[PDB]
Structure 1
Amino acid sequence: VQSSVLGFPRMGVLRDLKKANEAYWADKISQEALLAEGKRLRLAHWKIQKDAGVDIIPSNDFAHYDHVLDHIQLFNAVPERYTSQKLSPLDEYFAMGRGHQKGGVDVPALEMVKWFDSNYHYVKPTLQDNQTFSLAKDPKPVREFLEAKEAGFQTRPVLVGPVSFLALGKADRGSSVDPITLLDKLVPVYVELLKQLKAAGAESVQIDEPVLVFDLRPEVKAAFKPAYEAIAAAGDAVPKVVVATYFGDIVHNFDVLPAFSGAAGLHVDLVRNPEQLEPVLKQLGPNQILSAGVVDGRNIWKNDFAKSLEILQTAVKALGSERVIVATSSSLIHTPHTLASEKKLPSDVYEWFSFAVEKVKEVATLAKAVTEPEAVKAELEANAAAIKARTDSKRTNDPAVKERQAQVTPEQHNRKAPFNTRYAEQKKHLSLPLFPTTTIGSFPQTSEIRVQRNKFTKGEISAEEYERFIEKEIELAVKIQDELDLDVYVHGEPERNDMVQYFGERLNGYVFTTHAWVQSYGSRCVRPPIIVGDISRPAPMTVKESKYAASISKKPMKGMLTGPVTCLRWSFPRVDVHQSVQCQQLALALRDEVVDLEKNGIYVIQVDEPALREGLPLRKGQEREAYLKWAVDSFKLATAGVENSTQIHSHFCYSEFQDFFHAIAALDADVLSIENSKSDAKLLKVFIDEEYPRHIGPGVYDIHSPRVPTLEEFKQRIEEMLAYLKPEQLWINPDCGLKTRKWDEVKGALSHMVEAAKYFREKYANKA
């Protein structure tokens, strides 16, 4: 039985790729130097995988920025605004990913969006009506396959397949083409590329068609047959093809699978959906190979070898060992490089973890164990003991948390009274005028704010000295808000650097790494907290600063929290219990924090869930409905403990809620803010159609621009919003937090903002 890795993280043991990319962008190293570092990393990572005993090692998984972006360049699908600058291929590549400035011109990046339900972002293929495709000179997959081959590594090239490539694409500005209709123009280029890989020596290729986990539009569904017929028709002139799927099951698309009858194999994610194994077995062709994705590509836990081998033996029993491959469930770009870089973790949790270097060893150990378990009996035993240690740990058996969860009731999820009743108490308490003004949360992060925070966390300044600095920062924020005449204040969060790490550090059940970085957005990486045990709140988390802020505030002061769904999803979650269990534990901890804020003079509490939509199961059905139920319930459980006169706010970082508005409405939030200023106001139609009864602040100010909008621009935006929303429900606020702006920009814009609000207060004043 062979082992397989679908992809390896690109950044390097010390984020070498980030350092080199950025040094190149800053003119500190040459193109040759940067490309040499890329080469050094590919070689090092191929070696890791070969040394671990992996049989099927991926190539073309490496990328300097994004692999979908690599495919855009590979098929010459680059828009004119990039090709006319006559840049080197590398600079052109980077131009599409992050932007460029040649000859005076200022070329923006292509749109980047999230890769399925992961925290990784890809660049969307952006296509013209008259789009055609051709293979780039020196095509990357061929180049890199030959590179590996020359260094002694036989590898399996990874391509994003033609259907997914178009399905994940969009029409460019000025065009209206539905990308999938370009299929016939694209497929011949894949066929040519595949012939070139075969000629270079590639015996097989992994072709990712991840959109198979979606509910497919009939046009996209219809595309697989001609695409994969063309590939099969090429016969021995192209490599054997393993079609790969991950992050969801594909059992709803068994009518699409006949398109792959001429393909050599199918990969499915048996970590996310182990139950799809046997139904999928029934759908395999007589000689097709099952690539069984049983080592988690999305989390950091040591594999349960015994559980994985039961899955594998089921497959081997049905197919024979020669038709089974042990594989990672997905690419490992979603995992950190290596556990070995971590030197400060609690000694008991090491034996529960596996990062990417450890996982590629796991698929090899499993593959050997399938047919020769005696050869690795010591490793199998050690693995079983580690899993048992995790099961029996104090961390995962907190009796108090268990008892608290057991006693949660449905009624505890609901506010004391509906909004019709509540809002009466709130308008008095808060003394809000028509068109109340507020901001979303963070205030400018200045050099001094970062420096001081760094000194404290590194222990250079005392707690007392830092606390006094934070007080003065809050006093400044309040003074400035006084001068602006805002109606609801924020403290500006000078003490916070990250909206999940800040809370993870103040909760039981979390551990933090120093080096476990994961690529997120180009060369921007994240270092997620890890949930290792039952979660509870040992002490007040945000009360100290909010309490101080309210003590000097002449206006209502916003409390500021991250919701339980986001604390969960932007961490590495546990895999030993269901995520709904973890989320409820977070919701109870946050319920206490909310009630604590209310007890300390805070009666406007903003609870933000930027990960709510991200976690949606990728296809409709009982699973998606299950998620929405506990995700919504968790938010409600966290926020329902307040008095009627207390307002619950929530900020949403997107302007559209397709197939999602019902969940938003179910939150029962008193006030919603949404990112909207750059969107057509007509998108506010959803509030009319859904007859949304509570209050709404669509952003009026694009905070991602340093430009100060004029008073007239603010008034015009407000007028446009009032075409869709009732006056009494409209809040006036920016699109987003103000951390990335500078105070002169902020004072100017917020001044115009408040003046515009005051104008409409006059305009909507009662007549004589």
Structure 2
Amino acid sequence: SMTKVSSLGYPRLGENREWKKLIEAYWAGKVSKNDLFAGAKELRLDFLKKQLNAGLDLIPVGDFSLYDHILDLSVQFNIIPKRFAKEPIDIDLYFAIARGNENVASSMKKWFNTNYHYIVPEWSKQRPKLNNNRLLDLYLEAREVVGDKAKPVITGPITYVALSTGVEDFTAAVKSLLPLYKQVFTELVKAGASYIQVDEPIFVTDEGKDYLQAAKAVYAYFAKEVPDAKFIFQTYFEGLIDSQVLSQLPVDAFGLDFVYGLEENLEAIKTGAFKGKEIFAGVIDGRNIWSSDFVKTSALLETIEEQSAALTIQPSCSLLHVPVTTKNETDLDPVLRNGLAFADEKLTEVKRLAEHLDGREDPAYDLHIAHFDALQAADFRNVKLEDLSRVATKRPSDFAKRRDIQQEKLHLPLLPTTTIGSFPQSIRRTRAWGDISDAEYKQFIQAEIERWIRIQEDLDLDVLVHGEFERVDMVEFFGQKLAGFTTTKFGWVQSYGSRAVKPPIIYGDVQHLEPITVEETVYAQSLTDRPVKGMLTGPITITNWSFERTDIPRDQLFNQIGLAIKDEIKLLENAGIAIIQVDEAALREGLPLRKSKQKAYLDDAVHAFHIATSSVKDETQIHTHMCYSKFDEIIDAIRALDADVISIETSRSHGDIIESFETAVYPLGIGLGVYDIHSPRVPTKEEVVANIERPLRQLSPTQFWVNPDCGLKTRQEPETIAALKLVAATKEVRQKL
């Protein structure tokens, strides 16, 4: 009949990141409060109009923020860090919590498994109370533009509390918030609201299973206290846990993710559990950038419609997690661009899906399938790659046998010193080549490489790196020369505060075509007698940082990339580079939300790592760096990698992170990060030696390397040089044998 379409949220950035410019200009004291709010109002009415014109029946209002949607609630609900208690509650206090001012900023955490970061609330003695009418104002504003189509959105109490810190008693904290939400909801209804989106994504997670009863209590409360509201129990990022129980919640509608929770939610509904309820079906991928598979999606929608009292079509999650629009991506090949969909294009998609379901005829529907079909048939999605059956997935010799061979070639001292690869980048001004001969740019880079070689040689580091001055991003630097990769001109996505990323797109089969890092590495090696490490990026980081294809399985993509890394590695080795390092920084973000699904992921990663590194000679030393804190869960996978040396970050834990390696009696090489690289502070000589010796408690000294926690690209040069000089701390422990 008449199928509604909606959306959970929308980006704040604006087509050209004007949002970013506005607020960064405000912090710099370059924008008055008046222009700040007016600027933000312009953006909001703009976004509301786009969504209106797209045909949405329920338009999300409330998710727009000047920094973070969790921070919004903290300030609105009076959950203000103790240290900020005496400050007037206004926009300046708001940004002080987000950024610090006397007082440090609140901490941020990853928003579930996305690349977005929220601001962690800090609970204490102060009682919750409504400090403003943030959401009501936004609602009434929206009404003037879109009318009864305005749908207020907000993060629910249960998720909010679970995402917080300092909470002593979970249920008491939740309960204290109920009256606030009640008034908020009551006012909204009085102002004309009917449907209200209430985000409880905590109920797609393992931790969620602890809060099933709270959910029943909390939402029985709302149904009783605000009977006229049509609540949408909104979830996303995975399937609904304990669907059979949660489906009994006294709400008018459930928001289910059929993109990242397809199997679980599809079986949840096949049960007929939602037959008497309305389903908000998240059928459009809200955190990837591919035009929908219409045949697949529409078929799924029919199945959902038959198993519900009512259906509203929307994306799987807020459009916050994708770029704004493809309309100005003019560098793209038409067949690709026509098969791409960013936020704005998804609004159009959701509308067309609803009209097809209602039996309306639209030429755009089949045309969309035509463009989709053209993409799948593109030559770049049909590249003939290397036959994997002829690729080594294990090295000819075991760790033991390789260690001697490598030791006999390298003759490295006990507790060798080295760095993770990157040095401070002063030049970004030079990189303006704008226009400037490639020869000048290269001469410039090579000059800076030689300079840090001498530095390293004077610090007396045992294994040198070139500095990666030529690299602005550890992922895009590789995708630039790999087939199947592309970059966008304007595809920015907010990560935290005013910071945003422009992820590369993996649109076709990945294939190594030309040397990517060889020139710089070889040149560094030609300047010193000391071993120079090669630095590459692994499949985990590459796929996690990029927008990957969804038309092939994770493992297939991973293996493709592995082959590419193998090919690069072969070039490096042929050119005489004897120590090669594979960098992985996104394991924390790449690891699936559900524990039960994490092994298959790690398995895939381990295999792709073997594909990449098993074709080197036994004398070639393979290192891998992994940005990670907790190793207790994945130590099996790590041993499985069979890396000659894995460099880990221990400084923050004073080496206690070695624990998991101790219990597992890890036999392979380990690099000990003994200095926090994210702090401008220069560690003490005693602070470092103690950090090195802790891991020497049980495991043999012959297994360890000494190095900073991570790359030094973020740090300044002076503190870096001093911090590295450290080598003395290493030389000290070596002295006392």
TM-score w.r.t. the length of structure 1 is 0.92
Residue 203, structure 1, aligned to residue 194, structure 2? yes
Residue 112, structure 1, aligned to residue 112, structure 2? no
Q: Contact 2:587 / 2:627 at 8 angstroms: preserved in 1? A: no
Q: Contact 1:114 / 1:121 at 8 angstroms: preserved in 2? A: yes
Aligned match of 1:240: 230
The 1:272/1:258 distance shift into structure 2, 3 A limit, reads closer
Residue 758, structure 1, aligned to residue 736, structure 2? no
SS in 1 for 2:674: coil
Distance 2:104 2:248 in 1: 38
Q: Contact 1:77 / 1:125 at 8 angstroms: preserved in 2? A: yes
Distance 2:263 2:719 in 1: 54
- When structure 1 is superposed on structure 2, of 339-348 and 522-531 the one drifting more is 339-348
Q: Contact 2:203 / 2:209 at 8 angstroms: preserved in 1? A: no
Distance 2:89 2:171 in 1: 29
Aligned match of 2:455: 480
Aligned match of 1:373: 360
- When structure 1 is superposed on structure 2, of 550-559 and 281-290 the one drifting more is 281-290
* Equivalent residue for 2:389, pick from 407, 410, 416: 407
- Cα deviation, 1:575-613, whole Å, max 9, x if unaligned, reads 111122111111101011112111112111111111233
* Equivalent residue for 1:145, pick from 139, 145, 151: 139
Distance 1:117 1:152 in 2: 32
Aligned match of 1:94: 95
Offset at 1:720? 3.6
Offset at 1:620? 2.8
| Code of the aligned partner of 1:335 | V
| Code of the aligned partner of 1:383 | H
SS in 1 for 2:510: strand
Aligned match of 1:436: 416
SS in 2 for 1:731: strand
- Cα deviation, 1:240-263, whole Å, max 9, x if unaligned, reads 11111112122x422541552x10
TM-score w.r.t. the length of structure 2 is 0.96
Aligned match of 1:221: 212
Q: Contact 1:654 / 1:676 at 8 angstroms: preserved in 2? A: no
Q: Contact 1:180 / 1:219 at 8 angstroms: preserved in 2? A: no
* Equivalent residue for 1:748, pick from 718, 722, 726: 722
- Cα deviation, 1:468-523, whole Å, max 9, x if unaligned, reads 11211111111111100001100001111001110110100012111010111211
Aligned match of 2:78: 76
Distance 1:93 1:730 in 2: 46
Residue 733, structure 1, aligned to residue 733, structure 2? no
Aligned match of 1:494: 469
Distance 2:633 2:184 in 1: 38
- Cα deviation, 1:627-661, whole Å, max 9, x if unaligned, reads 22212211221122222222222222232235333
Regions of 4+ moved over 6 Å: none
- Cα deviation, 1:56-79, whole Å, max 9, x if unaligned, reads 100111111111111221221111
Offset at 1:740? 2.1
Q: Contact 1:167 / 1:220 at 8 angstroms: preserved in 2? A: no
- When structure 1 is superposed on structure 2, of 51-60 and 578-587 the one drifting more is 578-587
Q: Contact 2:493 / 2:501 at 8 angstroms: preserved in 1? A: yes
Distance 2:7 2:171 in 1: 29
- Cα deviation, 1:682-703, whole Å, max 9, x if unaligned, reads 3332221222222222321122
Distance 2:169 2:524 in 1: 52
Q: Matches of residues 7-406 of structure 1 in structure 2 within 5 Å?
A: 7-84=9-86, 86-100=87-101, 105=102, 107-128=103-124, 130=125, 132-138=127-133, 140-153=134-147, 154-171=149-166, 177=168, 179=170, 182-216=173-207, 219-236=210-227, 239-250=229-240, 252-258=241-247, 260=249, 262-281=250-269, 282=271, 284-319=273-308, 323-374=310-361, 376=362, 378-398=363-383, 400-401=384-385, 404-405=386-387
Distance 1:218 1:276 in 2: 15
Offset at 1:724? 6.1
- When structure 1 is superposed on structure 2, of 331-340 and 593-602 the one drifting more is 593-602
Distance 2:543 2:75 in 1: 36
Distance 2:245 2:703 in 1: 47
- Cα deviation, 1:6-50, whole Å, max 9, x if unaligned, reads 111111010011000100010000122112111111110010000
- Cα deviation, 1:387-423, whole Å, max 9, x if unaligned, reads 110121101111x21xx245356xx221222212211
SS in 2 for 1:309: helix
Q: Structure 1: where are the runs of 5+ without partners? A: none
The 1:535/1:186 distance shift into structure 2, 3 A limit, reads same
Distance 2:700 2:224 in 1: 61
The 1:475/1:716 distance shift into structure 2, 3 A limit, reads same
Offset at 1:704? 2.1
Distance 1:729 1:278 in 2: 50
SS in 1 for 2:560: helix
Distance 1:334 1:181 in 2: 32
SS in 2 for 1:465: helix
Aligned match of 2:531: 556
* Equivalent residue for 2:517, pick from 542, 556, 560: 542
Aligned match of 2:635: 661
Q: Contact 1:170 / 1:179 at 8 angstroms: preserved in 2? A: no
Residue 704, structure 1, aligned to residue 678, structure 2? yes
Distance 2:34 2:331 in 1: 37
The 1:532/1:258 distance shift into structure 2, 3 A limit, reads closer
Distance 1:74 1:9 in 2: 21
Offset at 1:217? 6.0
Q: Contact 1:510 / 1:530 at 8 angstroms: preserved in 2? A: yes
Distance 2:320 2:152 in 1: 16
Distance 1:202 1:585 in 2: 50
Distance 1:329 1:517 in 2: 19
Q: Contact 1:564 / 1:638 at 8 angstroms: preserved in 2? A: no
Offset at 1:125? 2.2
Offset at 1:302? 1.0
- When structure 1 is superposed on structure 2, of 487-496 and 304-313 the one drifting more is 304-313
Offset at 1:680? 4.7
Distance 1:78 1:159 in 2: 18
Q: Matches of residues 559-578 of structure 1 in structure 2 within 5 Å?
A: 559-578=534-553
| Code of the aligned partner of 1:136 | N
Q: Contact 2:287 / 2:321 at 8 angstroms: preserved in 1? A: yes
| Code of the aligned partner of 1:423 | R
Residue 719, structure 1, aligned to residue 714, structure 2? no
| Code of the aligned partner of 1:145 | Y
- Cα deviation, 1:712-767, whole Å, max 9, x if unaligned, reads 3322332344346532222211111111222221211111x111111111111xxx
Residue 450, structure 1, aligned to residue 431, structure 2? no
